[PDB]
Amino acid sequence: MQIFVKTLTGATITLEVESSDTIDNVKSKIQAAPGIPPDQQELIFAGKQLEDGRTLSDYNIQKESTLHLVLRLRGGHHHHHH
């Protein structure tokens, strides 16, 4: 088992999936290298948005499947400095 995931930098990362792997567990595993908010990471099919409350088995397809992860900003609107 091996999947490809494209990040915001363009560097594809290799990871292993699990039945017990939930959208929350993936976040908890970010307790190694800080820098980005774990709550800002989500899976998105460009035109198909995934549910945070969904489990792996709930969206566990057959090997060989491209995964897309985007990091959009939503920490409040920015003030336009004139």
Side-chain angles (χ1 to χ4, degrees), residues 1 3 16-21 50 54-65 67:
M1 42 221 53
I3 49 139
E16 253 183 79
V17 292
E18 229 158 72
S19 260
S20 32
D21 239 83
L50 280 245
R54 276 229 171 282
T55 33
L56 200 113
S57 267
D58 258 273
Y59 241 92
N60 195 25
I61 27 149
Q62 276 172 21
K63 60 187 163 203
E64 254 210 270
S65 264
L67 276 137

Side-chain angles (χ1 to χ4, degrees), residues 22-33:
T22 26
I23 311 306
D24 251 89
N25 254 69
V26 194
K27 264 176 226 129
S28 242
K29 223 151 195 318
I30 315 177
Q31 239 166 38

